[PDB]
C-alpha cells in the first residue's frame, strides 16, 4: 500500500534539547530508500536517509494540546510512499505545584482595624517546571468575604471596612492551579483577629544522634515564629526520663548536650521525649512541640 503503518515514538522534552541532535531512525523496507518530509515541521527535520533530526529545541508548552509532534515523510527510490510519524512528546519536568509557605498549617494574623486591601499573607507555591504559571485562588472562604486572594502575586488582602474580632479565626481554603500542567493541594489558611500563639517551624521535632556527641555540641535548632514579631524564649523539659540531659538556647532555640551519653547504661533511655516551649515576652502567649531525640551506639 501507499500508506506505511503510522510511526509511533515517545521522547521526552530533553530529548530534543539540541538543534541538528538525531532523535531516531525512520526505519525502510529496502536498502536504497530515501526520505524527505511532507510539510515543514518547526520541530523536526527529516535527513535523506530518514533520520529525524531536532529543528527548534523541543519546548512541550509550545506543541498544541495533542502534545505530539505530527508529521509525515515521502519514501522514494513516481512510486512513492507516505507515512505519518507522531513523536508522543514527555514533558518530564511536569510535577504538581506545592505550597512553600512555611511554617505548614498557614498561620497569619490580621489587624483589628486592617483598613481595605491590607495584605495578610502571600500565598506561595512553586511548579518544578519552570515553564509553567500558577494562579492563586480562593475555592473555600470561611471569612464572610472578608479576604480576597490576588491570583497573579499570591498575595491575601482584606476587604471592607468593618473591624475583625480579636481571636477570631478567619479560614480561606487556597489552591495554586497550573495554567499548564495540575495544582496543589487545597490548604487551610487560618487569620487570627489581631494575635494569636507562636508557632513552630516543624509540627514535631526529632534528632537522631550518636553516643558519643560530644558534650555540650548542637543536636538540633528550634525556631518558633512569633506573629507579632516579638522575641521569643524557647524552655526545655523532659517528659519522662531524661532530665537535664539536654538544655536548649533561651534565645537561639539551640538544643545542645548537656551530659555524656552511654548506650549500654540502661539508666539512660536510647529515646528521650522532651517537650520545648516557645514564650513570647509580648504578653502570655506560648506553644509547645515535641522533641525526640534517638540515641543510636557506636
Ligand atoms: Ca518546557
Ligand atoms: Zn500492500
Ligand atoms: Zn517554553
Ligand atoms: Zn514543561
Ligand atoms: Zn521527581
Ligand atoms: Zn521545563
Ligand atoms: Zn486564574
Ligand atoms: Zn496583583
Ligand atoms: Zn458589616
Ligand atoms: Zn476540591
Ligand atoms: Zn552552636
Ligand atoms: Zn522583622
Ligand atoms: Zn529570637
Ligand atoms: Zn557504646
Ligand atoms: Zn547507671
Ligand atoms: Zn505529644
Ligand atoms: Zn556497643
Ligand atoms: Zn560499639
Same mark, same amino acid.
Given at each position: 500500500s501507499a500508506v506505511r503503518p503510522t510511526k509511533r515514538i515517545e521522547?521526552?522534552?530533553?530529548?530534543?534539547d539540541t538543534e541538528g541532535k538525531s532523535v531516531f531512525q525512520l526505519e525502510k523496507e529496502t536498502d536504497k530508500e530515501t526520505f524527505k518530509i511532507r510539510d515543514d515541521n518547526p520541530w523536526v527535520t527529516v535527513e535523506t536517509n530518514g533520520a529525524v533530526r531536532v529543528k527548534k529545541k523541543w519546548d512541550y508548552e509550545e506543541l498544541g494540546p495533542e502534545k505530539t509532534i505530527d508529521f509525515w515523510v515521502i519514501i522514494t527510490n513516481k512510486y512513492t510512499d507516505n507515512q505519518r510519524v507522531i513523536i508522543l512528546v514527555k514533558d518530564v519536568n511536569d510535577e504538581p505545584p506545592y505550597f512553600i509557605n512555611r511554617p505548614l498549617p498557614m498561620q497569619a494574623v490580621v489587624q483589628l482595624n486592617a483598613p481595605p486591601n491590607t495584605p495578610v499573607f502571600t500565598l506561595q507555591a512553586r511548579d518544578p517546571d519552570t515553564d509553567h504559571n500558577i494562579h492563586y485562588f480562593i475555592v473555600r472562604d470561611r471569612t464572610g468575604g472578608r479576604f480576597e486572594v490576588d491570583e497573579?502575586?499570591?498575595?491575601?488582602?482584606?476587604?471592607?471596612t468593618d473591624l475583625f474580632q480579636l481571636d477570631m479565626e478567619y479560614v480561606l481554603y487556597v489552591? +495554586?492551579?497550573?495554567?499548564? $500542567?495540575?495544582?496543589?493541594?487545597?490548604?487551610? #489558611?487560618? =487569620?487570627?483577629?489581631?494575635?494569636?500563639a507562636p508557632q513552630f517551624y516543624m509540627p514535631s521535632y526529632e534528632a537522631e544522634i550518636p553516643e558519643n556527641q560530644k558534650?555540650?555540641?548542637?543536636?538540633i535548632s528550634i525556631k518558633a515564629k512569633s506573629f507579632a514579631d516579638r522575641e521569643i524564649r524557647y524552655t526545655l523539659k523532659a517528659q519522662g526520663q531524661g532530665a537535664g540531659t539536654f538544655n536548649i538556647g533561651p534565645t537561639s532555640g539551640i538544643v545542645k548536650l548537656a551530659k555524656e551519653l552511654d548506650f549500654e547504661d540502661l539508666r539512660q533511655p536510647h529515646v528521650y521525649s522532651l517537650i520545648v516551649? +516557645?514564650?513570647?515576652?509580648? $504578653?502570655?502567649?506560648?506553644?509547645?512541640?515535641? #522533641?525526640? =531525640?534517638?540515641?543510636?551506639?557506636?
Open positions: 521522547f521526552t522534552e530533553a530529548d530534543g497573579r502575586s499570591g498575595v491575601v488582602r482584606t476587604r471592607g489552591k +495554586a492551579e497550573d495554567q499548564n $500542567g495540575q495544582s496543589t493541594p487545597e490548604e487551610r #489558611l487560618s =487569620i487570627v483577629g489581631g494575635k494569636r558534650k555540650d555540641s548542637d543536636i516551649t +516557645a514564650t513570647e515576652d509580648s $504578653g502570655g502567649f506560648s506553644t509547645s512541640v515535641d #522533641l525526640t =531525640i534517638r540515641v543510636t551506639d557506636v
